[PDB]
Amino acid sequence: YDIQAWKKQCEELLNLIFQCEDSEPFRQPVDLLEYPDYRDIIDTPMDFATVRETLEAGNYESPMELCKDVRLIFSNSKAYTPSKRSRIYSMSLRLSAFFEEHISSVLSDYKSALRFHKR
């Protein structure tokens, strides 16, 4: 029932994600120089460094907010991909499955802790 525990749990999960080879395309912004049409398709860029920096700045109030930004990394990859069998998109799907597997307890525990608080 620790209302703050999600933050370190998310730091730990981001550490795991940064060690995963599948995260390499998503660790930093799109060199618009290598993908010049990227911002014609993607309205709101997002990367794992921005997520980690937002978390470390204390600019997430809840793990739901972090989860929304991580899911935006994956929806951007799905929107930008020319093919459902594009190398980078395929890496996004594996990393998304890994993230969802790990974030599910973080969200459950946070929401349970907040319910216990306002019991």
Ligand X SMILES: Cc1ccc(C(=O)N2CCN(C(=O)NCC3CC3)CC2)o1
Distance between CA 22 and CA 53 in Å, rounded?
Answer: 20
Element housing 16 (H / E): helix 6-19
Q: Kindly indicate which of the ranges 6-14, 27-35, 50-58, 105-113 contains the residues binding ligand X, using the contact rule CB under 6 A.
A: 27-35
Residue 25 engages ligand X in binding (rule: CB under 6 A): yes
Is the CB of 37 or the CB of 61 nearer to ligand X? 37
* Sites for ligand X among residues 64-103 (CB under 6 A): 77, 80-81, 86, 88-89, 92
Distance between CA 76 and CA 39 in Å, rounded?
Answer: 10
Residue from 8, 12, 15, 28 binding ligand X (CB under 6 A): 28
Angle at 13 between CA 18 and CA 21, to 5 degrees: 25
Residue 6 engages ligand X in binding (rule: CB under 6 A): no
- The SS3 assignment for 57 reads coil
- Could you identify the residue written with the tokens 């459902």? 84
Residue 34 engages ligand X in binding (rule: CB under 6 A): yes
Is the CB of 28 or the CB of 112 nearer to ligand X? 28
CB 26 within 8 A of CB 50: no
- The contact set with ligand X (CB under 6 A) reads 25, 27-28, 30-31, 34-35, 77, 80-81, 86, 88-89, 92
